[PDB]
Design an enzyme around this catalytic site. Sequence first.
Site, PDB file in Angstrom:
ATOM      1  N   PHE A 140       0.850  -1.180   0.000  1.00  0.00           N
ATOM      2  CA  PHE A 140       0.000   0.000   0.000  1.00  0.00           C
ATOM      3  C   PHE A 140       0.887   1.232   0.000  1.00  0.00           C
ATOM      4  O   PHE A 140       1.769   1.366   0.853  1.00  0.00           O
ATOM      5  CB  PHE A 140      -0.936   0.027   1.211  1.00  0.00           C
ATOM      6  CG  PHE A 140      -1.602   1.357   1.429  1.00  0.00           C
ATOM      7  CD1 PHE A 140      -2.684   1.742   0.656  1.00  0.00           C
ATOM      8  CD2 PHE A 140      -1.145   2.226   2.406  1.00  0.00           C
ATOM      9  CE1 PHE A 140      -3.296   2.964   0.851  1.00  0.00           C
ATOM     10  CE2 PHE A 140      -1.753   3.450   2.607  1.00  0.00           C
ATOM     11  CZ  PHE A 140      -2.830   3.818   1.829  1.00  0.00           C
ATOM     12  N   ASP A 226       9.785   2.207   1.102  1.00  0.00           N
ATOM     13  CA  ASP A 226       8.668   3.023   1.568  1.00  0.00           C
ATOM     14  C   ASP A 226       8.657   2.952   3.089  1.00  0.00           C
ATOM     15  O   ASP A 226       8.133   2.002   3.676  1.00  0.00           O
ATOM     16  CB  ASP A 226       7.359   2.528   0.960  1.00  0.00           C
ATOM     17  CG  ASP A 226       6.192   3.462   1.229  1.00  0.00           C
ATOM     18  OD1 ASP A 226       6.248   4.247   2.197  1.00  0.00           O
ATOM     19  OD2 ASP A 226       5.208   3.407   0.461  1.00  0.00           O
ATOM     20  N   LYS A 255       4.088  11.351   7.005  1.00  0.00           N
ATOM     21  CA  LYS A 255       3.260  11.190   8.197  1.00  0.00           C
ATOM     22  C   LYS A 255       3.944  11.755   9.436  1.00  0.00           C
ATOM     23  O   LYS A 255       3.921  12.969   9.674  1.00  0.00           O
ATOM     24  CB  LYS A 255       2.918   9.713   8.407  1.00  0.00           C
ATOM     25  CG  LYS A 255       2.177   9.090   7.241  1.00  0.00           C
ATOM     26  CD  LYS A 255       1.791   7.648   7.511  1.00  0.00           C
ATOM     27  CE  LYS A 255       0.338   7.395   7.156  1.00  0.00           C
ATOM     28  NZ  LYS A 255       0.202   6.208   6.266  1.00  0.00           N
TER      29      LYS A 255
HETATM   30  C1  LIG Z   1       0.198   5.837   4.759  1.00  0.00           C
HETATM   31  C2  LIG Z   1       0.997   5.216   3.649  1.00  0.00           C
HETATM   32  C3  LIG Z   1       1.229   5.893   2.449  1.00  0.00           C
HETATM   33  C4  LIG Z   1       0.360   7.043   1.983  1.00  0.00           C
HETATM   34  O1  LIG Z   1       0.467   8.202   2.777  1.00  0.00           O
HETATM   35  P1  LIG Z   1      -0.623   9.372   2.584  1.00  0.00           P
HETATM   36  O2  LIG Z   1      -0.171  10.633   3.274  1.00  0.00           O
HETATM   37  O3  LIG Z   1      -1.930   8.905   3.170  1.00  0.00           O
HETATM   38  O4  LIG Z   1      -0.818   9.652   1.117  1.00  0.00           O
HETATM   39  C5  LIG Z   1       2.275   5.493   1.627  1.00  0.00           C
HETATM   40  N1  LIG Z   1       3.094   4.443   1.981  1.00  0.00           N
HETATM   41  C6  LIG Z   1       2.876   3.775   3.166  1.00  0.00           C
HETATM   42  C7  LIG Z   1       3.763   2.633   3.561  1.00  0.00           C
HETATM   43  C8  LIG Z   1       1.831   4.159   3.996  1.00  0.00           C
HETATM   44  O5  LIG Z   1       1.622   3.490   5.172  1.00  0.00           O
END
Ligand SMILES: *Cc1c(COP(=O)(O)O)cnc(C)c1O
Length: 402
Positions: A140, A226, A255
Site C-alpha cells: 500500500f 517506503d 506522516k
Molecule cells: C500511509 C501510507 C502511504 C500514503 O500516505 P498518505 O499521506 O496517506 O498519502 C504510503 N506508503 C505507506 C507505507 C503508507 O503506510
Amino acid sequence: PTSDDIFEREYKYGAHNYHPLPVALERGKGIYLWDVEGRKYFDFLSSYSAVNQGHCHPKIVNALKSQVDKLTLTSRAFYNNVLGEYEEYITKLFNYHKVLPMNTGVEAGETACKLARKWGYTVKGIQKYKAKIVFAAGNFWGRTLSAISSSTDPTSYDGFGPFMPGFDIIPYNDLPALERALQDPNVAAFMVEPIQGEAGVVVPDPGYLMGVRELCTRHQVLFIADEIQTGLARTGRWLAVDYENVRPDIVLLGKALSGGLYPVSAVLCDDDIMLTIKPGEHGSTYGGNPLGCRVAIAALEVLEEENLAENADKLGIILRNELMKLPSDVVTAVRGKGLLNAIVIKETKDWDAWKVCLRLRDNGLLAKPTHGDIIRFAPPLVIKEDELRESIEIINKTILSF
Ligand SMILES: *Cc1c(COP(=O)(O)O)cnc(C)c1O
C-alpha cells in the site's frame, strides 16, 4: 455536539469513502484522546504512525506557531529562508545527497516512480516507456490511480478504470521471486515496505532486506524503501531497514515527518538519481513550504532528542511478550516490530475484530481492524512503561470478556 450528531453531520454532508469507528474525537494530547463526551482513550493507532511524537507535541506546536506569523507559502517560483535549512538537516540525518519535498505519501510514491522511470530511460538506457517497476503483494502506498494500479487489494482498484501499465507484482518476503523478476532488463526499480503495515503488519524473514539490496545491486535496479509508516523510530530504528543495515537507493518518508501537524513528505536519494529530474519537470504547489519545513524540523528534532527509537524497542519487546500470553483460543498470531504490532484473532460467527475494537473503545482504548481478524497496536512512541502496562491490562480485559 454529541457523538451521534457529529456522525449524522458527516453522514449527511461528507462522502462515504470511510466507515470510521464510532468515536467522535475532540481533543488530543500525547498518548491520550478525548471525545466530545469527555471520555479518555488510549490512542493505539497513532493516526497510522503519524503522531509517533504524541498528539500536539509542544515543540512542534511552538515551531508551527512561530513560523505561521512570519511566512507560510511563497510557492517554489521563488525561494524562502526555511526550505534550505530543512533540506540540509534531513539530508545529513539520513545520509543522502538530496531530498525532494512533497506533501503526502502518495505524492512521494509518485515522485519515486517518476524518478525510477526517468533514471531507467536516461541512466540505465531502457528504451522509452518499456520501464517496469516491481511491487510486493499486499503493498500500500496510497489511492491515486497509479497507486491502486499496483495494489493487490480488490477494494482499492475494482471498478476504477484502466490501470497504469509498467507495474509488476511479486509475492512479499520472497527473494527467489525477486531474483526471477529481475531477469527482465526493463525493470527500473523495486519498491517495497520493510514491514507491510496496511497488510496487517506482516514482517519479512530476517535477511530479506539484505537479499533485496543484493539482488537490486546485481541487476542495477533501484531499491525504493517506503518508510512512510515504518520509519521515524516506530519500529525501533530511524528506519526499519537499519535493522538489516541496508541502504536503499530511494527512501520515502511522511506522516510522522510532521508529528501530525502538517502534510509533509520527502523523497531522499543521491545525486545520480535525483538529478535526472530537470527544473520544470516535477513539483507541487505546497511541497517545500516554510511552515511544513519548520514543522518537520521540530518533529525530527523531538524524535532524535527524546530517543524515541530506543524506547520503542524496549516497549515493543514488552508489548509483544505480553500479547503472546494471550490464549491461542482467541489470538491466533502476534507480530510486529517496535511499537508497530498486530494481533490476528480467530474470527468466528460469534465475534470479529470490529466487535473487539468496539469493546476496546468501551474500555478506553482505540484500535482499528484492517482485515476483519487483524487488530493494530501502535501507540505513540512517547508512551511510558506504566501507561503501556495499563493499556495491556485493558486489552486483556477486552479479549477475555468474549
Ligand atoms: C500511509 C501510507 C502511504 C500514503 O500516505 P498518505 O499521506 O496517506 O498519502 C504510503 N506508503 C505507506 C507505507 C503508507 O503506510
